[PDB]
Design a protein around this ligand. Structure first.
Ligand code: MET
Ligand code: SF4
Ligand code: SF4
Length: 288
């Protein structure tokens, strides 16, 4: 039994979404945060997450419930237009575009991701766009394609501390490669906001978490999120422990002192959790 800290705007977003051919990770993961992200924050912003390039990943990360197969179906060439259209009609404030990894594609899908960003920004430049990208196996030209697509925030996850990369992630991912992605995004587009996420509860200790946060700062990562690893099914990695609410508040203070522009830290925090609210409050510093 999970610890208890892991248990108008929303209905307006839900009713509008019912008519549009758009499908989210928010509902198709049964995310416990949909009440918060979908309009229930301080600024009442709407954030949601859409996953491009199919529902089958070429990788098999043991923390992740996305289905895996060696030869996923080909890309839906209509998805960039259909997605960007459906987002603009849904009326979102901040959208997180993410995707499965497509190691079967030479550019890992970067052109597909970039086309979606570009379509959306032309329809409505008022929408903030974050892309949570694959590592593209370190392909600098693929990273460059997305970084130049006009997005506001370039995100890519390290997921865990360097010592646990081989346990937690598919062998095609690693810590230095992920840092190279974030560094190259900033090199190609210096005014982009860079962002990464770490899960706690997988066996890391405090010394490794601090060292990781320090290294992320040296790589000029602007924003950080920390949340609890929650085991999707009994076949996935076992939870080593549930981090306390007060310990997550400790890490937020540590991230502030290290100079992250925001450190979103809490048991239910995910990469996309209230991403629009964190952007508005800490980067835009909007007065309500
Ligand atoms: C949907 S998981 C995040 C995006 C990408 N599949 C990655 O692991 O890097
Ligand atoms: S945390 Fe991510 S998937 Fe969950 S409701 Fe918020 S944006 Fe959607
Ligand atoms: S690459 Fe991303 S989508 Fe694929 S298994 Fe790993 S975390 Fe899940």
């Amino acid at each position: 039994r999970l610890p208890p800290w892991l248990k108008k705007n929303y209905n307006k977003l839900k009713n509008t979404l019912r008519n549009l051919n758009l499908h989210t990770v928010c509902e198709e993961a049964r995310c416990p945060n949909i009440g918060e992200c979908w309009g229930g924050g301080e600024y009442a912003t709407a954030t949601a997450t859409i996953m491009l390039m199919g529902d089958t990943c070429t990788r098999g990360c043991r923390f992740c419930s996305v289905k895996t197969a060696r030869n996923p179906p080909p890309l839906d060439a209509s998805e960039p237009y259909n997605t960007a259209k459906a987002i603009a009609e849904w009326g979102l404030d901040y959208v997180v575009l993410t995707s499965v990894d497509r190691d079967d594609m030479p550019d890992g899908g970067a052109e597909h991701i970039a086309k979606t960003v570009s379509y959306l920004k032309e329809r409505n430049p008022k929408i903030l766009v974050e892309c949570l990208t694959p590592d593209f196996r370190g392909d600098l030209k693929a990273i460059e394609k997305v970084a130049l697509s006009g997005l506001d925030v370039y995100a890519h996850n390290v997921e865990t501390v360097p010592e646990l990369q081989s346990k937690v992630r598919d062998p095609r991912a690693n810590f230095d490669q992920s840092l190279r992605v974030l560094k190259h995004a900033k090199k190609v587009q210096p005014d982009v906001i860079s962002k990464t996420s770490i899960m706690l509860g997988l066996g890391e200790n405090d010394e490794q978490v601090y060292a990781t946060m320090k290294a992320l700062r040296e790589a000029d990562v602007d924003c950080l999120t920390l949340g609890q690893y929650m085991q999707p099914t009994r076949r996935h990695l076992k939870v080593e422990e549930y981090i306390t609410p007060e310990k997550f508040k400790y890490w937020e203070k540590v991230g502030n002192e290290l100079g992250f522009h925001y450190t979103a830290s809490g048991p239910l925090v995910r990469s996309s959790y209230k991403a629009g609210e964190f952007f508005l409050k800490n980067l835009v510093a909007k007065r309500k």
